Every structure is written in structure tokens, then in C-alpha cells.
Amino acid sequence: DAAGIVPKIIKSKAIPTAIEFMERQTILFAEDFLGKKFPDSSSNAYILLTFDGNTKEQVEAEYETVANLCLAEGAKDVYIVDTVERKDSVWSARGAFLEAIKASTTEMDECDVVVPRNRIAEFIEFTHDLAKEMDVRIPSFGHAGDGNLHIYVCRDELCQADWEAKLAEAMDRMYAKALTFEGLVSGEHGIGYAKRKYLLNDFGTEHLALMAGIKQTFDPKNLLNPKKVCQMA
Amino acid sequence: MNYKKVEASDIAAIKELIPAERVFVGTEIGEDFSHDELGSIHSYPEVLIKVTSTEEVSKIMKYAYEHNIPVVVRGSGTGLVGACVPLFGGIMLETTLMNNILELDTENLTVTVEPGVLLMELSKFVEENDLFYPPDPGEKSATIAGNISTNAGGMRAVKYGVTRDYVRGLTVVLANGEIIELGGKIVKNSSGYSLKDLVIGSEGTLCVITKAILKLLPLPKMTLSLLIPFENISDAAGIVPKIIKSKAIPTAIEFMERQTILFAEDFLGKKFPDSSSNAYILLTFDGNTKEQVEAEYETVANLCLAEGAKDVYIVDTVERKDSVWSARGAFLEAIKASTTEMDECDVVVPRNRIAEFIEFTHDLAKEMDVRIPSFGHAGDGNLHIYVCRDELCQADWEAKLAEAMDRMYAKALTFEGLVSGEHGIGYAKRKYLLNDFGTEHLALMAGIKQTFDPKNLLNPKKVCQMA
Amino acid sequence: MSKILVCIKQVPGTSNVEVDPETGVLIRDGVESKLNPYDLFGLETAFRLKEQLGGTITTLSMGPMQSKEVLMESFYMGADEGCLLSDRKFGGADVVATSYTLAQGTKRLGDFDLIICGKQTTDGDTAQVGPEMAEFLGIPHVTNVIKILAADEKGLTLQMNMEESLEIQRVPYPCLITVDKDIYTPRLPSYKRKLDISKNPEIKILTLKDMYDTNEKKYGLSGSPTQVERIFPPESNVEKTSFEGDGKVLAKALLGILTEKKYLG
Amino acid sequence: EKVAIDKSLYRGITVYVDHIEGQIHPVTFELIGKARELAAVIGHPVYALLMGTNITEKADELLKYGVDKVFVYDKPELKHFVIEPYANVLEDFIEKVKPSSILVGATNVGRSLAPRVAARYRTGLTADCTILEMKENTDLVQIRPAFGGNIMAQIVTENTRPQFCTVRYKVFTAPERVNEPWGDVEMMDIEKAKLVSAIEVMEVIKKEKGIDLSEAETIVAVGRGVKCEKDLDMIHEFAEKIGATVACTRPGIEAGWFDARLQIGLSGRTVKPKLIIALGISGAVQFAAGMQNSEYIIAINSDPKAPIFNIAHCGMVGDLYEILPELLTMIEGPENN
Ligand SMILES: Cc1cc2nc3c(=O)[nH]c(=O)nc-3n(C[C@H](O)[C@H](O)[C@H](O)COP(=O)(O)OP(=O)(O)OC[C@H]3O[C@@H](n4cnc5c(N)ncnc54)[C@H](O)[C@@H]3O)c2cc1C
Ligand SMILES: Cc1cc2nc3c(=O)[nH]c(=O)nc-3n(C[C@H](O)[C@H](O)[C@H](O)COP(=O)(O)OP(=O)(O)OC[C@H]3O[C@@H](n4cnc5c(N)ncnc54)[C@H](O)[C@@H]3O)c2cc1C
Ligand SMILES: Cc1cc2nc3c(=O)[nH]c(=O)nc-3n(C[C@H](O)[C@H](O)[C@H](O)COP(=O)(O)OP(=O)(O)OC[C@H]3O[C@@H](n4cnc5c(N)ncnc54)[C@H](O)[C@@H]3O)c2cc1C
Ligand SMILES: [Fe+3]
């Protein structure tokens, strides 16, 4: 229900500055890290919007358009976050999602797949079925307005041989599912050295031969950052 | 170099891949396929093929790569720089039969189009569904993949941008026949090199676009225009940084001087609503309610009256909008009707250097005794400049056109601008790209075309090729 | 010359209109009402005469209190003063009752050397309020003026067009004129004039109590000889017909169509 | 309640004869055939009002269409149309004969004279009607387009007489001429004080300018199917038979045959005429975008697979070089044999 309201929000011509989804299990990490409760966690999923403008009446026409639209489409409530102290009570929780996940685990490895926006909810529900099956913790959040999902696989208390077997299986199945959803490997962070194999699975060998021939044009002696992105994929 | 002429055995092998009613050879080509709207160069292809599918394009590119035949893709033949003209006369792929709009995704706000959907019928289709395709080139009969290949921009680029900002994905066919999908219905992209952004602006020299996914916006309901007279073009161009910094961003910002308006009055037969001034700024605001449009234009109109505008005229009615915008929309045809022939320059400059370049063309017109009318978009720096032949003889016109074009492209080089901002390089503007960018800059462009097309078959001697 | 009256009307902002099959009332999309474009040529004709003769320009309108917006809109184009004719007893009027209350409001506002009505409205399209208004005033009138050749301080030299001729007339003051489409290009409403006070004028409203004939049998629906019985969309049909067989087999079919549409060719 | 009138006092249907110094407009003969149809429903006669200076010999031309009485006012001050002698005579005609209905044309004279006399009697008047239906209790039912033609309106005038109505040209048909004419002319008179006028006419100049394409309602458009420039003389004589403005495609501009203001399309004029005749034009998307909103499109093209036939209301497949000079001989045939 949270990911489905985003096409109706944008088509109402009141474009938010930020559209964030956060589930309850990710919020419970930030409550233990910051030491402060979230202002309302009586629900399982949340949409955190942001509107900007130049006058108070222009922002008021923007947010009352979406708040009337959300309440008519199955939202439990709409909470107004208007003051500096209220914004710092909600956005310091969102700003500490990454540090709260790191504080709760021994080590982690991450994933920043972008999917089509109508496939956000199917991918988030897929990581819940994958975490329940592989018995690993997979907390996730992301930006509901563009399809980028920040997904973290935690090692918790796994032994070193069992962690590299479960990390490889959880990462391979999530990058193959985003391939089936017609998304890409990375939408923010890039390919670099770590995601070279998943770029060779998504794009063909003819697609990566065009990338390698372009680096041969700019850098024929192969000196500028070798074996990265489109190299030894 | 090494180009095989199309013989009768190549006609039979092509007609096995394509139905013979979409293959044209020899006298059934037509004079319209030998040129585009540049008009200087004329060159017939040997085969004209009207393709209908991606797999039909890939079978032709597999044949031409095997048999070493050059290929030029053509849309509506609308571009102004000679980019779709087959100088070596091989295969001409023609895409106006692929005019199907494949899918309208209302969840992702995307539309999937075939190459050959016209801009007039795409923008009509999405606005029936309360959606909006923001790039507006001046000719609406252009192919969408022709707008992608030329990076075609227009009036709304000050607020919305150009065709590059709205291409989400492409299905391209390389010169050897390989089919490549480039983007998708995603919004964020950081996976590898942006090969999609190389195809945008490549003018058919790298690959053949066979599908496009375009980003759409929700359609604004209201629209209001403002007409602001000024004393000269220096006062008119100088108000544009103050307008944008007042956070009331106009949809279109157009400057027009009085000399260009006098052409449109003679062409249309109707006078302009107020031509007691020498320069004008024609704004446009859009929005969803009448009250937030009224807050937008009254911000700029209270602003513009404080820095030396003679007046601010409200253009709020469909009859008043047609009285002002049909004059601006007929600037190009009024200049064509006043001369024997002309040539077009579309330099983009920095936005603070618009007024010095327009005043430079006035000093150049008096010095060379040619008529140089000009207009353009004051919100982005693109100037549409025309050197009119009038009554010069053919020897004196070619010497005066070459001098007036060389001094205007050298002055835009000094102003740290580029050769073209809208129309592209093609065949006509190749030597000015070699003057602006160095030989090392064009060796990078020629080495990229060698990567996509090592046999040099997809559109030879265009953009970077032999600059 | 000097005193000039301009009759302007507020119309629907667009004429794209369809009726509900059993409401009987117009399916108007919205109410972003405007001044009609045919009266912009009547306002612009007064502005060229004021720049030549130096008098004043009065605008006159008949309708509700919402029609005060087109009186303020004519002020931004350069009108000097305005007058609304808002009353509940004036509504439901046809041409005969509209041109009577416009002529009664003219006699209340004093004498004018020239009354400039537009060619037609965009909702009624009857194009006959102007000639009926000059009958109640008793002044001469000239319709369909495309050109003003002379603008003497006693009278005008006009160019009235027909379908195929150009009549040139010399009409003296006081008189009514009806200009048609594209006599001049109308000037745009200035925002600098909008910021004067709100505008200097202050519209003077008139009711049935202010008229010199204060009897409601001649105004509104009571003084209307006509009335609408029903309004319905026009029945139009597109028929694609083909004709083959060359020679004069097609030429008899083309002459059979051109004579059925009365072109006689 | 409302006071009633006796409609038995007002009988007869008068057609005001429109003319320019004797030469009768063709809208008069179409109204005679409509008045003879409408007055046969009620049994009333059909009258004709005649105003001019030297036109009393043009009166029995009205008698050859079935008009019962031709009232002729033939004073010397009625040469050009000035409103005060014309409205005083038409008011004098109503005071004597008392017709029940007066049908005038939708010409600029009839759209000016009829409201001046309808306001003088405070009677109803409907504008540029297309359908006229007579009720047997002597009530004319006038159907007219409004809102620029977007709706039609049914108007009735139940109390006041004579009910005026202006009728649009070339909607009704002229009747066949009678072999024997019946009826009479009636020479009428009026005092000279009613025929003075403040307006005085300088001159009546013929329109000698070529109309712009966006104002034209009939257009003959030529294309690349016309081979040489001297073939346009066969087309220019055809377009003046129907009164059409000659336009062209962009190949016509590149050959220099026409002015650039005569080009139809996106690079030229967007037109909406009542009738467009495309001669040798394939319906390309740049030409067809400027003329697709025409109300009637006739296309003459040799190729039956041309895209002009997808929008043409009448698609004729054949060569124009054999049709149009043979049709121009069919123009002199039924007209002058
Ligand atoms: C009156 C007029 C006004 C104009 N106004 C503007 C304007 O405001 N802004 C502006 O930017 N441009 C303008 N243009 C020119 C503009 O470039 C063209 O209108 C359009 O971009 C070219 O599209 P086309 O379909 O006409 O292409 P073509 O000329 O047929 O093709 C242009 C280029 O695209 C290539 N191409 C076409 N289709 C494909 C494909 N499927 N795959 C690969 N390459 C392909 C061709 O090979 C050639 O390189 C104007 C032109 C005219 C005549
Ligand atoms: C669908 C429809 C059909 C109608 N048919 C008829 C009909 O057949 N006969 C009839 O007598 N009435 C008819 N009416 C009534 C009448 O036309 C209008 O209701 C109203 O009187 C407006 O006049 P107009 O549009 O005819 O003005 P027009 O005669 O079309 O306009 C002429 C000029 O008069 C001036 N003017 C007109 N109205 C006003 C006004 N209210 N205030 C100020 N200036 C004004 C303007 O300068 C205008 O340009 C009809 C109304 C409707 C809605
Ligand atoms: C950017 C751009 C803008 C353009 N804008 C415009 C514009 O605004 N307006 C415009 O008109 N064009 C415009 N064009 C040109 C447009 O392509 C033309 O419509 C087209 O190319 C030529 O039109 P045509 O039908 O006259 O020529 P053709 O298509 O060559 O005409 C030949 C047709 O006539 C038929 N024919 C031939 N001989 C005969 C005969 N004897 N009898 C009967 N039929 C015959 C043939 O069967 C065929 O259908 C534009 C082009 C471009 C590139
Ligand atoms: Fe431009």
C-alpha cells in the first residue's frame, strides 16, 4: 500500500522533494541506536514525504493536495511534520538507518539495485521471503519515488565459511531477481570492483565490449584504473 | 574508402529479407529522399528501405556489414545540417512506417514509442491521457528518434530541458546487426558507461534506434503569457537572471527585436499588438490553478517594472495568445518569404553574452551590407541567426556568406559558446567543430565511432568524420 | 469624437459547448469567462479615435456583477470610465430587451458622439444588438465597418463592406458603428495600468430605479418577444464516397456534387 | 396573465428582395420557394418588397417565381443602402399590408435593415436560420446555429407580429419558374420627409483584392500533379467558376508558381474552408495537418493508395488533366445550351 500511492501522488501535480519508504523493522534499529522512539510506530510501513516552496501558502496547497489524496486511498493517518524539532525527530531516524544497521551486526554487505517504480513492493516482499528462507537478516529501505532500494545482508553470528556461502547465495538471487524485474545492478553507488560480475550478467558480452572499446579509445595503454567497471567483469 | 556499390544481386538478397513493396530502387526513390531541409547537398541512395521492425533493421545491418555497403538512417528528412543525406549512396533506412506507440505506462509515467512516431502525434496522444512530453522542437512533423539522434531542444528548455533529459531507454541496432538495450523504465542509472547518452546527439553515426522509452510529466492545466517591451536588446536580455532568481521560473523566455517582428507582420497580414518598442521579452507561465499562475506572473511583472520596462502586457486569452504566438511561430517562414535564399546559424552562448552577440550581428550586417535577422531563446542562450542572400549574385553571395558565417562562429568561440545548441553538426558545421574543439577532442569522437562502427558504414563523413 | 461609448459583453471563455440530452441547459466546461474578441476590435477602434480626437471613452456592459471584470479589463486597455447595468429584472433578455436596457443606460449616462458596438458575441451570435440599440436611441447606424478613412470632429468617413462591394459613407455625429473582425489589432491589457490605484474609474452600477423609463414590462424576460424552446447539438455526418471510372464519368459526379452544394461549377 | 393578439389581422409572408442597383441577389429566389412552402401550410399569400431607384422593370421577374404581390417602392433616394429611408419604407409597408412573417437574407444589408425595423415594432427576430417550420396557428419555428455552430436553437415568436427572421444563403433551393405568372405588382408611394438621411454615400467600390487563405471558405489546391505553370490557367478559370482561392503545396512554392502566403500546411497556412478540392496532392502529413479540419474535402488523385483518401469526404481516383477541361466544357453545357 505504501509503494502504490507514489504514482497517485506524482500525477496529482504536487511533486514532493523526497519520497522515502521505511518499514517498522528498520525503524526499530534506529530507535535502539539513537535512544529515542519514533513519533508513531503503530504501523508496519511508512511514506516520508517532503515539499518545498517559497511561501507558506504555496507549500500548504501542495501538502493538503497529497494528504487528501492519501487519506482517500487507504492511509491510516497523515502526520504533519512542520517545525524544526519535529523534522529533527523524524529525519534523524531516517538519517541513521545506515548506522543503526551497522551497529546491530558484526559485518554486512550491501546492494543498491534500482527497479521500475511499480516493482518496488514486489522486490521488498521478495527480500522478506529470502531472509526468512536463508535465516539471514536482510533490512532494507530506499527511495520510493525512483526505484532505488538500499538492501543490506547482515552476517550476525555466522561462522566465516557459512557467511561467505550465505552472502554469495543471497546476493546472487537478489541480483537475478532485479534482472527479471528489468532493473539494473546499481542506481547510486556504481559498479567499481565489487559489482563487475553482476554487470556481465545483466548486460551482454556485446554490451560490455562496447564499454571496453570506449576505454581503449580514452586509455589505450590501460593505465587509468584497470580491472574496474567493464574490465574482467 | 572500400565502399561496394549496390548491384542487382544485392537487390535480390535485400528483397528476400524485406517485402518488395517496401524496397525502392533507382527511379522509384523520389527527390525528397535525396536531401533534407539544408538544401545545399543532394545525394541519392541506391536502395531505399522502409523498415517496420527491429529484426528487419538487424537483418539489413547484417547484410551491409557483410557486403561493405554504407547505411544512412532517415526520419522525416527535417534536420537542417545535412545529417541524413547519403553522400556515398548505399542503403537508406526509412523509419516513418514504424509510427506505433507501443505502450503507455501510467504507473512509471513512461511511454514506449517506435522510431517514426511523429512529435505532433506523440504529444497529442499523451495529452489526451493528462500527461506531458516537455521537449518542443519547432517542427512537429519530426521523428522522435530523429529528435533523440539530434538532441533536439526548443522553447521549453529553460524550465524543462531538452530531449536528452527525457530518454529513459533505447533499443539500438549496431552496424554488425547486434541488438542492444540501453536503459529501461528505471529512474536512476549508475551501472557502467552511459552508452545511452552517447546515442543521444550522435545523428545516426553510431547505431540505429529501433525503440525508445520516454519520460513523461503530468500535464499542467493553466497557461499564461507576458509581453514585456524594452528599450533595447541589452535591457531585454539582462532581466533574465533576475527573473529566474525570483523563483518564478517561466516555461518559455523568448527575445524578439522589432526588425524580426516587422517580417511576421508582413507575412501574416496582421499587426503585432504593440510594436512601439525595439525589443521584447515574451514569457510563459504554466500551472494547475489560476491563482498560482497569477502569483507567478505578478512576481515577475512587479519585478520587471522595477528595472526599466516600459510596460507589462498580460496575454491570458486564447485569442490573445494566438495573436502573439503565431507571430513568434511564423518568424522562420517570414524570413524565408522575404529573401531569395538564406543560411542558418544556431550558436549557443553563455546567457550573459546574449546581448553582446545580438549587437555584434547588427554591426556585422551594416558592415557587410547583408540582412542578418535574428531571434532566439533568452533563457538558455540559443540564438537563431539567418544570413539572407536578398539580391546578391552567386559569386558575391558565396563570398559574403562564407565571411559572415566564419566571423559569427569565431565570435561565438571567443564568447566560450558552441557551434550548435539545437540543430547539430551533420555535414554543414563540420569545420566549425574542428575550429572550436581541438584535434585531440575530435580524435576521441572518431575513436568512439570506430568502436561502434569499425567498418565506417553508419553515416561516413558526418559530425566528426573528416571535420 | 470626445465622448465615445463602447458596449462590451462578458462571454464564456470557450465556445466548445455541448448540451446534456435531458437537462435542457448548456454543458459549459467551466467559468473562466472573458471579454469577447469581437468587442476587442470595438475597444481598439475607440482607442485609435481617442488618439486622434482626444476625447473620453466610456465602457458599458449588461449582465450580473461578475461582468464587472470585463469592465476592469477594458480599463487596463485604456478606457476612462465604465458602467455596469446589473439588476435581477434585466436577466433572461433577448436582443430586443438587451438593446432596450443598453439604450436606457446610454440616456442615463448622457450624450455620446459615437457608440461602438462589436460585430457579434460568441454565445448568442445574433449580431443584431447594435442595430436594435441605435433604433431606440434614434441615431444613425452603420454596420460592418472595416476601415475609418476620416475622423473629423463632426462625423466619420467609413468603409462598410458587403460580400462583394465596399460602400464608403459619410455619417455625422451622433451615430452608432458596428466594427467587424480584424479592423485593427487590439492592444493588450497593461499591468502597469492595473497597479494605478486598482484602477482610477470606480464602475458606476445602474439598476431599473436609475433608468428614465422605470417600468419592468419592457426589460428582461417580460419584454422579450422570443424565447428558446429547445437546444440540441447539430446533426453532422461524414460520408466517405469514392468514384472510379475515368472520363466524364467522374466529371458528372463532380458537377453533381458541386451543384448539390450550390457552387454551380 | 398576458394580453393576447389576433393573428387573423396579420396574413401573408413577405420576402424582402435583396439587390445591388437592380441585380437581384440569389438569396431572394431561395426564400420565395421557402415562403411558398411555408404559406401553403396556412393558406396565406406570398409577398415581395422592392426598394430601389430604377428597378420597376425588375418586378415581373419576381412574378415568374410564384409571388402573389410585388410591392415596389421606386423613389430616387433608394439607390444605395442607407438605413433611414430603407427602415421608414419597410415600416410604412408593414403599416399598410400587415404581413404575418418577413423573410430577409443573411446579407450585410439584411442583417442591418431587419433589426432596425424589428426593434421599431418591438417584435422578435432570429438570426441566420437554417430550418424554417410553419405551425398551422401562424407561428414560425426558426432553427438557428449558435455558439459558433456548436449548438442549434429553436426559437418561436408567439405574441408579436410580424415575426422577422434572417435566412442563411444557399440553405434552401430556388423553385422552378412558373409557365404562366399570376399575381400583380403594386406601385407604392411615401412622402419625401421619410426618405431623408444623415448618412450620405460617397461611392460603392467593388472589392478588388485577393482574399487571404485563412479567410477563404472555398479553395482549389494544386500539387505536384500539375506539371507546368501554364496548366494553372485551366485551373484558375475553374476556381473562378466556384469562387475558390487557388492554393498549392510546397512543390508549388519551390517552382515559384505562387506566393508563399498561398501555401497550405505546417510551413504555411492552416485553413478551415467549407470546401477544398485537392488536385494531384498526396496527403502528406505536413500538408494534411493544415487542412484536415475542412468541412468537405474533394480529392482527385491518380494513385488510389494516396494518404489524401483517408481524410477526403469525396475520393475521386483519376487523372485531373482529362477531368477538369472536360468538366469546364460541362460548365458551359447545362448552363448555355
Ligand atoms: C522549420 C523547422 C524548424 C525546426 N525547429 C527545430 C527546433 O526548434 N529545434 C530543433 O532542435 N530542431 C529543429 N528543427 C530540426 C530538427 O533537427 C529536426 O526537426 C529533427 O530533429 C530531425 O528529425 P527528423 O525526423 O526530421 O530527422 P532526419 O533529418 O531524418 O534525421 C536527422 C538525423 O537523425 C538520424 N536519425 C533519424 N532517425 C534515426 C534513427 N532511428 N536512428 C538513428 N538515427 C536516426 C538521421 O540519420 C540524421 O542523422 C527544425 C527543422 C525545421 C525544418
Ligand atoms: C443559444 C441562444 C440563441 C439565441 N437566439 C436568439 C434569437 O434568435 N433572437 C433573439 O432576439 N435573441 C436570441 N438570443 C438572446 C440573445 O442573443 C442573448 O441572450 C443576449 O441578448 C446577448 O445578445 P447577443 O449575443 O445576441 O448580442 P449580439 O447581437 O450577438 O452582439 C452584438 C454586440 O452588442 C453588444 N452587446 C450584446 N449583448 C450585450 C450585453 N449584454 N451587454 C453589453 N453589450 C452587449 C456587444 O458590443 C456585441 O458585440 C439567444 C440566446 C442564446 C443563448
Ligand atoms: C519540414 C517540412 C515541412 C513541410 N511543410 C509543408 C507544408 O506546410 N505544406 C506543404 O504543402 N508541404 C510541406 N512539406 C512538403 C511535403 O512533404 C509535401 O506535402 C510533399 O512532399 C509533396 O506534396 P504533393 O502531394 O504536392 O507532391 P506529391 O506527393 O509528389 O504529389 C504527387 C501526387 O499527385 C498524384 N498525381 C500525379 N499526377 C497526377 C495527375 N495527372 N492527376 C491526378 N493526380 C496526379 C500522384 O498520384 C500522387 O498522389 C514539408 C516538408 C518538410 C520536410
Ligand atoms: Fe531554438
Residue numbers in the entry:
A (entry chain C): 235 to 467
B (entry chain F): 1 to 467
C (entry chain E): 1 to 265
D (entry chain D): 62 to 398
Task: Please share excerpts from the published article on this structure.
The electron-confurcating lactate dehydrogenase/electron-transferring flavoprotein (Ldh-EtfAB) complex, the research subject of this report, catalyzes the endergonic oxidation of lactate to the central cellular metabolite pyruvate with NAD+ as electron acceptor driven by simultaneous co-oxidation of Fdred. This FBEC reaction occurs in anaerobic sulfate-reducing and acetogenic bacteria. The confurcating Ldh-EtfAB complex belongs to the bEtf family, the largest and most diverse group of FBEB/FBEC enzymes. bEtf family members are built up of a variable dehydrogenase/oxidoreductase core and several peripherally attached EtfAB modules.
The cryo-EM structure of the fragile Ldh-EtfAB complex from A. woodii was determined from a sample cross-linked with bis(sulfosuccinimidyl)suberate (BS3), because multiple attempts without cross-linking failed. The EM density was only disordered for the N-terminal Fd domain (2-65) of EtfA, for which model building was impossible. The 255 kDa heterohexameric complex has an overall size of 150 Å x 100 Å x 60 Å. Lactate oxidation in Ldh is assisted by the catalytic base His423 and a metal center. The intermediary Glu37 and Glu139 may harmonize the redox potentials between the FADs and the pyruvate/lactate pair crucial for FBEC.
